[PDB]
Write a protein that binds this DNA or RNA. Structure first.
Ligand SMILES: [Zn+2]
Length: 66
DNA sequence: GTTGCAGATAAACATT
DNA sequence: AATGTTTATCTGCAAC
């Protein structure tokens, strides 16, 4: 349900991937990772209208996992 | 057989 | 300058 999905933590709506918070509050891929690592509400001063982009990270597959 | 969703990695940026 | 930190892009799996 992307339609209407707004980041509960920073209200952004241009997320690369929609994540969910432990409380069930929709969040943008950035808040979900930043929040999980620091578990604190970050000011919207880091929110950017459009999505930032960069040269694509080297192409890599993966490794076998236990 | 195709789409969409969730999650993780590595690189690059900022700081000092 | 190196480390720590951050975020965008990739791949996979499940249900119909
Ligand atoms: Zn957010």
């Amino acid at each position: 349900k992307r339609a209407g999905t707004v980041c509960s933590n920073c209200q952004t709506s241009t997320t690369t991937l929609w994540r969910r918070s432990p409380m069930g509050d929709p969040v943008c891929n950035a808040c979900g990772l930043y929040y999980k690592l620091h578990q604190v509400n970050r000011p919207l001063t880091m929110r950017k209208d459009g999505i930032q982009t960069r040269n694509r990270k080297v192409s890599s597959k993966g490794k076998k996992r236990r």
